[PDB]
């Protein structure tokens, strides 16, 4: 299983289809698939935790990858299955998702605390808790509740996906230290990110 609070299991949620995969909510997803293109972790079909995921080092680090394709608000139908089947406690999870209450180019990494009404997080925390740590991955929010679909599946502008980009990026940088167990170091250096 899973080791202290060395990352050993790196989420990221979002939608399956083309049709979302540019979306904001799939901010996991471009993290995670950006990741995987680092470190050369194929991420491949895995049916039978109802995700794509890979396995593969990190730094000198044995790490898991998943994408649950389940769509959003079932993502716990994947990331409890898997976690559980490998033995990985929620200490040594990172979980990258969009984040309403922050802006684009703001990136923080996060321990514990509720799903902030993402639908994503809202799947998995009754599971396993709030211990995992949280990649916040910042896109606005489009003003009430209402907008909050045509918001989080829209595409983002340019100036804005720049923004994300960018913060994803300095992201990618900093897993070092998380899969090193140094949670302290990396959120010091995640959460100073500016884009500008």
Same mark, same amino acid.
């Given at each position: 299983?899973?080791? +202290?609070?060395?990352?050993?299991?790196?989420?990221?949620?979002?939608?399956?289809?083309?049709?979302?995969?540019?979306?904001?909510?799939?901010?996991?997803?471009?993290?995670?698939?950006?990741?995987?293109?680092?470190?050369?972790?194929?991420?491949?079909?895995?049916?039978?935790?109802?995700?794509?995921?890979?396995?593969?080092?990190?730094?000198?680090?044995?790490?898991?990858?998943?994408?649950?394709?389940?769509?959003?608000?079932?993502?716990?139908?994947?990331?409890?299955?898997?976690?559980?089947?490998?033995?990985?406690?929620?200490?040594?999870?990172?979980? $990258?998702?969009?984040?309403?209450?922050?802006?684009?180019? &703001?990136?923080?990494?996060?321990?514990?605390?509720?799903?902030?009404?993402?639908?994503?997080?809202?799947?998995?925390?009754?599971?396993?808790?709030?211990?995992?740590?949280?990649?916040?991955?910042?896109?606005?929010?489009?003003?009430?509740?209402?907008?909050?679909?045509?918001?989080?599946?829209?595409?983002?502008?340019?100036?804005?996906?720049?923004? +994300?980009?960018? $913060?994803?990026?300095?992201?990618?940088?900093? &897993?070092?230290?998380?899969?090193?167990?140094?949670?302290?170091? $990396?959120?010091?250096?995640?959460?100073?990110?500016?884009? $500008?």
């Amino acid at each position: 299983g899973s080791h +202290m609070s060395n990352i050993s299991l790196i989420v990221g949620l979002g939608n399956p289809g083309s049709e979302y995969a540019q979306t904001r909510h799939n901010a996991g997803f471009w993290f995670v698939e950006q990741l995987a293109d680092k470190y050369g972790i194929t991420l491949k079909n895995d049916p039978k935790f109802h995700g794509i995921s890979g396995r593969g080092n990190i730094e000198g680090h044995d790490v898991r990858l998943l994408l649950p394709m389940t769509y959003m608000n079932r993502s716990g139908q994947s990331v409890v299955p898997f976690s559980k089947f490998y033995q990985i406690a929620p200490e040594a999870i990172l979980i $990258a998702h969009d984040e309403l209450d922050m802006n684009p180019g &703001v990136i923080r990494l996060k321990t514990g605390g509720g799903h902030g009404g993402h639908n994503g997080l809202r799947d998995i925390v009754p599971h396993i808790g709030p211990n995992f740590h949280r990649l916040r991955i910042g896109i606005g929010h489009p003003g009430s509740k209402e907008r909050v679909s045509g918001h989080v599946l829209g595409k983002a502008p340019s100036n804005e996906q720049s923004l +994300m980009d960018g $913060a994803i990026d300095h992201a990618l940088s900093k &897993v070092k230290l998380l899969v090193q167990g140094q949670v302290p170091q $990396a959120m010091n250096q995640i959460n100073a990110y500016k884009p $500008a």
